[PDB]
């Protein structure tokens, strides 16, 4: 009885974290890419202002 | 009279040729630096040109 009830409470905590990992693997990697593309892009924006005057 | 004359003749050629390299040294290396920042201007502009699509 107590073994079965506890396996089931432990099951609820594994399940819920399996949903947390699934969104964490999406959002941490999506934010990473978007931060990198965003910060690369500004360096060209600012760059070209100056280097087109240098052209 | 041979030695002295033709040494004056040899001295003039040295004079001509040093006089060419003083003007020449500055231009060629300026040209080299021209071609350096040219390729940079050309690289930031290709990357600046699609910046709107990325944004």
Joined tokens for residue A54:
């240098």
Joined tokens for residue A27:
């959002």
Joined tokens for residue A17:
């974290």
B27-46 burial, b if ≥16 CB within 10 A, otherwise e?
Answer: eeeeeeeeeeeeeebeebee
- Our CA angle for B15, B27, B33, nearest 5°, is 150
- Method of determination? cryo-EM
How distant is the Cα of B22 from the closest Cα of chain A, in angstroms? 27
Measured in angstroms, the resolution is 17.0
Torsion of CA B14, B20, B21, B26, to 10 degrees: 160
Q: Helix or strand or coil: residue B50?
A: coil
Return the beta strands (E) in A1-55 as ranges.
none
- Which of B37, B45, B54 is facing A48, going by the closest CB pair? B45
Q: Which stretches of chain B sit within 8 Å of chain A by CB? A: 37-38, 40-41, 44-45, 47-48, 51, 54-55
How far is it, in rounded angstroms, from Cα A53 to Cα B34? 13
Most B CBs within 10 Å: which of A33, A35, A36, A48, as the mutation test of the B interface?
A48
Contacting residues for A55 by C-beta, under 8 A, at least 6 apart: B37, B38, B41, B45
| Inter-chain residue contact B51 with A37, CB threshold 8 Å | no
């Amino acid at each position: 009885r107590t073994a079965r009830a506890g396996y089931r409470g432990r099951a609820l905590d594994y399940a819920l974290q399996i949903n947390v990992i699934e969104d964490k693997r999406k959002f941490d990697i999506m934010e990473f890419v978007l931060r990198l593309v965003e910060a690369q892009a500004t360096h060209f924006q600012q760059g070209h202002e100056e280097l087109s005057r240098l052209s």
